[PDB]
Amino acid sequence: LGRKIYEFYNAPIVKFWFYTLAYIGYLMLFNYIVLVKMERWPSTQEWIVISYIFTLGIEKMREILMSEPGKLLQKVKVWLQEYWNVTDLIAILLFSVGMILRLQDQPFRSDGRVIYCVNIIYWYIRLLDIFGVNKYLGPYVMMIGKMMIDMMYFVII
Amino acid sequence: QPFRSDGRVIYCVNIIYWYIRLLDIFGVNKYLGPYVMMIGKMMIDMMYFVIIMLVVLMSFGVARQAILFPNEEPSWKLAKNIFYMPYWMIYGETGAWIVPAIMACYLLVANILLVNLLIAVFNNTFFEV
Amino acid sequence: TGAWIVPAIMACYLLVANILLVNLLIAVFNNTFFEV
Numbered sequence: 001l002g003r004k005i006y007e008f009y010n011a012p013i014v015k016f017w018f019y020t021l022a023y024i025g026y027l028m029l030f031n032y033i034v035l036v037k038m039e040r041w042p043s044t045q046e047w048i049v050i051s052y053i054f055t056l057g058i059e060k061m062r063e064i065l066m067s068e069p070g071k072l073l074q075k076v077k078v079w080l081q082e083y084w085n086v087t088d089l090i091a092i093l094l095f096s097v098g099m100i101l102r103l104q105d106q107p108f109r110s111d112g113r114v115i116y117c118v119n120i121i122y123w124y125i126r127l128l129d130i131f132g133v134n135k136y137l138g139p140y141v142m143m144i145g146k147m148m149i150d151m152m153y154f155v156i157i
Numbered sequence: 158q159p160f161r162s163d164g165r166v167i168y169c170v171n172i173i174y175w176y177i178r179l180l181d182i183f184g185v186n187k188y189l190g191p192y193v194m195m196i197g198k199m200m201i202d203m204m205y206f207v208i209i210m211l212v213v214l215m216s217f218g219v220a221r222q223a224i225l226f227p228n229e230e231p232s233w234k235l236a237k238n239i240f241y242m243p244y245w246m247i248y249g250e251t252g253a254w255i256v257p258a259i260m261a262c263y264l265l266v267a268n269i270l271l272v273n274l275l276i277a278v279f280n281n282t283f284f285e286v
Numbered sequence: 287t288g289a290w291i292v293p294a295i296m297a298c299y300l301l302v303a304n305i306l307l308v309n310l311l312i313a314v315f316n317n318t319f320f321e322v
């Protein structure tokens with residue numbers, strides 16, 4: 001029975017859906033902490049959000065430190081050749097910066113709330129990757145991808 | 158009262174379906190029927206597009222409220238404010254203004270992307286039908 | 287004589303330019319969905 005639970009929890013489909021449910025949990029909790037206030041110290045669900053981001057940073061760190069090249073700069077470079085992974089690093093750094101601005105007193109609470117207001121924009125646009133798996137949403141995402149370039153040249157015009 | 162009041166409401170919900178019941182019959186005419194089947198395929202295409210619409214428009218809605226009214230206590234009307242007011246955001250308009258600027262230009266480019274995506278989808282759907 | 291004239295020229299120009307740019311978006315984005 002223990003082997004059955006172990007085989008179920010190491011299947012990639014289970015890891016996918018199980019990460020996705022925790023990610024939906026993240027999005028609802030982070031919605032709650034951005035619509036409702038902040039205080040001198042963070043609320044409990046905001047601390048949950050901070051632990052999400054911190055352990056995500058640690059996971060990205062071992063993604064750096066368990067790649068196939070053996071020279072560390074090559075590990076960092078190959079890890080930074082994927083666009084979504086680059087913006088993941090960028091977002092973790094602004095969310096940390098927003099944390100340091102949030103912990104410092106007024107007028108820094110407002111700027112921390114601004115940074116956490118930009119983070120919900122990025123952490124809903126992160127969903128397009130995962131979406132690119134469903135048989136109907138994937139071509140839609142790829143159209144948005146090419147429409148970036150086409151709409152960009154239309155912005156110049 | 159008040160049972161007659163919401164009974165009339167349930168009747169007024171029923172009127173919707175008692176007109177949509179006409180699509181079946183509209184399927185005998187040589188020109189109405191392919192159109193009805195276009196509603197038929199466009200419903201699933203629109204459903205997946207509503208998934209995309211929630212992912213993009215809801216980030217803009219929550220971002221607007223977060224950058225807007227900061228002094229609203231826990232209530233279920235906040236969920237109403239995050240897709241009621243940005244549904245009528247056309248009525249609306251330090252770095253300071255820079256943050257809403259990013260939000261505003263993101264709203265315009267997002268509206269352009271999704272609306273033209275939707276017209277492209279519904280135009281491609283015409284081919285198979 | 288020039289009180290209304292050149293506002294009308296500018297408004298008509300903005301209207302026609304807005305139309306051709308919007309349908310430019312329409313046609314270019316109809317092509318993109320075909321390839322993908």
Ligand SMILES: Cc1cc(NC(=O)[C@H](c2ccccc2)N2CCCc3ccccc32)no1
Pocket residue numbers: 016019020022023026052053056059126127130
């Ligand atoms: C905080 C935070 C973010 C997050 N989710 C992800 O950012 C992402 C993901 C996205 C959608 C569904 C499931 C997971 N994810 C989590 C773990 C690291 C990683 C590696 C490659 C691809 C995705 C991925 N969970 O908490």
